[PDB]
Design a protein around this motif. Structure first.
Motif, mmCIF file in Angstrom:
data_model
loop_
_atom_site.group_PDB
_atom_site.id
_atom_site.type_symbol
_atom_site.label_atom_id
_atom_site.label_comp_id
_atom_site.label_asym_id
_atom_site.label_seq_id
_atom_site.Cartn_x
_atom_site.Cartn_y
_atom_site.Cartn_z
ATOM 1 N N UNK A 170 -23.789 -9.162 -4.692
ATOM 2 C CA UNK A 170 -24.071 -9.374 -6.024
ATOM 3 C C UNK A 170 -24.888 -10.694 -5.473
ATOM 4 N N UNK A 171 -24.109 -11.371 -4.233
ATOM 5 C CA UNK A 171 -25.042 -13.090 -3.885
ATOM 6 C C UNK A 171 -25.447 -13.024 -2.612
ATOM 7 N N UNK A 172 -24.657 -12.572 -1.489
ATOM 8 C CA UNK A 172 -24.999 -11.924 -0.655
ATOM 9 C C UNK A 172 -25.228 -13.055 0.817
ATOM 10 N N UNK A 173 -24.064 -14.142 0.687
ATOM 11 C CA UNK A 173 -23.695 -14.652 1.039
ATOM 12 C C UNK A 173 -23.489 -14.193 2.760
ATOM 13 N N UNK A 174 -23.411 -15.117 3.756
ATOM 14 C CA UNK A 174 -22.596 -14.934 4.887
ATOM 15 C C UNK A 174 -20.968 -13.837 5.091
ATOM 16 N N UNK A 175 -21.186 -12.991 5.754
ATOM 17 C CA UNK A 175 -19.596 -12.042 5.370
ATOM 18 C C UNK A 175 -19.811 -11.664 6.346
ATOM 19 N N UNK A 176 -17.832 -10.744 6.651
ATOM 20 C CA UNK A 176 -17.652 -9.814 7.774
ATOM 21 C C UNK A 176 -18.332 -8.989 7.535
ATOM 22 N N UNK A 177 -19.602 -8.051 6.739
ATOM 23 C CA UNK A 177 -19.557 -7.013 6.757
ATOM 24 C C UNK A 177 -21.254 -6.897 6.962
ATOM 25 N N UNK A 178 -21.742 -5.652 7.408
ATOM 26 C CA UNK A 178 -22.818 -5.130 8.047
ATOM 27 C C UNK A 178 -23.649 -4.114 7.089
#
Length: 164
Positions: free
Chosen positions: A72-80
Motif C-alpha cells: 500500500x505504501x512502498x517503504x524500504x522493505x526486505x522484498x523485491x
C-alpha cells in the motif's frame, strides 16, 4: 505435450540475493508461490547492474516486513516485487526495462493478503531477500512512447542458470 510439475525447494527463500532476510518476521502468514512460470519486473536500473548483483532488497534489517503495508505504501522493505503479468510494464511509464525472472518461491501477494486491495491488479509476487542473478533470465528495454518492448534489444543474462 502436457507440462510437468515444478521442483520444490525446502528453503522458501532459496532465491534470496540477501539471505539475512528473516522469514519469521513476514506478516501476515505468507502463502508461498509453488508454480515456476516466468515472472517479470519493471525496473529502471540497467542490466549491467542487475545481471551482476541480482535484485537486492532495499532493507532486509529494518525494512517493512508487513506485506499489506509494503504494497500500500512502498517503504524500504526486505522484498523485491515481481509480477505474474508479462504486460504490467505497460503501466510502468518511468521504467526503462522489463526483466524476465525464473526463480523458485516468492510470496504470492494476492493469496497472502487477498485480491480486493487497491493493487490486486498487479498480481505481484514478493521475493523476501530479493533474487540472485542466476534466477534472472534476461531483459527487454521498453520504448516509453508506445509502451512496447524493443525486442531486437532484449539481452540474456549470462549468469542465468536454468533449473527446471
Amino acid at each position: 505435450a502436457a507440462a510437468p510439475a515444478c521442483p520444490r525447494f525446502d528453503d522458501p527463500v532459496h532465491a534470496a540475493a540477501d539471505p539475512r532476510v528473516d522469514v519469521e518476521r513476514i506478516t501476515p502468514d505468507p502463502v508461498w508461490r509453488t508454480t515456476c512460470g516466468t515472472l517479470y519486473r519493471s525496473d529502471s536500473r540497467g542490466p549491467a547492474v542487475v545481471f551482476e548483483q541480482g535484485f537486492l532488497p532495499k532493507d532486509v534489517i529494518d525494512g517493512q516486513y508487513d506485506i499489506e503495508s509494503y504494497v500500500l505504501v512502498n517503504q524500504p522493505s526486505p522484498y523485491v516485487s515481481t509480477t505474474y503479468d508479462h504486460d504490467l510494464y505497460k503501466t510502468y511509464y518511468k521504467s526503462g526495462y522489463n526483466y524476465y525472472i525464473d526463480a523458485p518461491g516468492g510470496v504470492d501477494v494476492n493469496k497472502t493478503i487477498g485480491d480486493r486491495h487497491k493493487w490486486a491488479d498487479q498480481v505481484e509476487v514478493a521475493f523476501p531477500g530479493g533474487i540472485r542473478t542466476e534466477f534472472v533470465i534476461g531483459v527487454c528495454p521498453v520504448d516509453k512512447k508506445t509502451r512496447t518492448e524493443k525486442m531486437s534489444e532484449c539481452v540474456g543474462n549470462p549468469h542465468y542458470e536454468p533449473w527446471h
